[PDB]
């Protein structure tokens, strides 16, 4: 009647594309005096639209701030959108699929697009950290359990 498992589902990538870009290097020509790994501030923002039924267009807005010492160095921002056909599933199961999985497909594409605009601004190496965003939810939804090595000794 209702087995507690991902029933049926349907997942296909339709098209992935950069929908929007911003880069601002305010203090650019002067702040190049400062050479190290700039003070980062990533800020993750939401943008969405349902095109049709069984078709949802997921965007992940990755806002980037980077600063050298006490001043801002540069600013970057990408909106990596992606159309995905998702069907069958419903509830928390699809809340995770669009809430983690679809943006996680788009994360590498946004990631390179940031580092491109950083490189164009001739700024220090800025690479985003590899996170398993799905695992962050998965570890909450699982009971953690393990085993242990067993021994015996009689003197």
């Amino acid at each position: 009647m209702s087995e507690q498992n991902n029933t049926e589902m349907t997942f296909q990538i339709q098209r992935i594309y950069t929908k929007d870009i911003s880069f601002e290097a305010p203090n650019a020509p002067h702040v190049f005096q400062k050479d190290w790994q700039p003070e980062v501030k990533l800020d993750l923002d939401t943008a969405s639209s349902q095109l049709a039924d069984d078709v949802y267009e997921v965007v992940l807005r990755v806002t980037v701030t980077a600063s050298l010492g006490e001043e801002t160095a540069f600013l970057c921002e990408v909106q990596q959108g992606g159309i995905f056909s998702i069907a069958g599933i419903e509830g928390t199961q699809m809340a995770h699929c669009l809430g983690a999985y679809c943006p996680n497909i788009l994360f590498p594409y946004a990631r390179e697009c940031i580092t491109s605009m950083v490189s164009r601004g001739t700024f220090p190496q800025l690479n985003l950290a590899p996170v398993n965003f799905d695992a962050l939810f998965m570890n909450y939804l699982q009971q953690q359990a393990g085993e242990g090595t067993e021994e015996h000794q009689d003197a």
Binding site: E39, V40, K41, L42, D43, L44, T46, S48, Q50, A52, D53, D54, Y56, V58, T65, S67, E70, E71, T72, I86, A87, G88, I89, E90, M94, A95, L98, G99, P103, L128, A129, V131, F133, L136, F137
Partner: peptide, 25 residues
């Protein structure tokens, strides 16, 4: 200006999901 290294946070607003991903109605 802030000082940090990357970020990534589990969406507190969540993500706006599909309205009934079963029947085009």
């Amino acid at each position: 200006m802030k000082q940090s290294t990357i970020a990534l946070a589990l969406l507190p607003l969540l993500f706006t999901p599909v309205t009934k991903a079963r029947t085009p109605e």
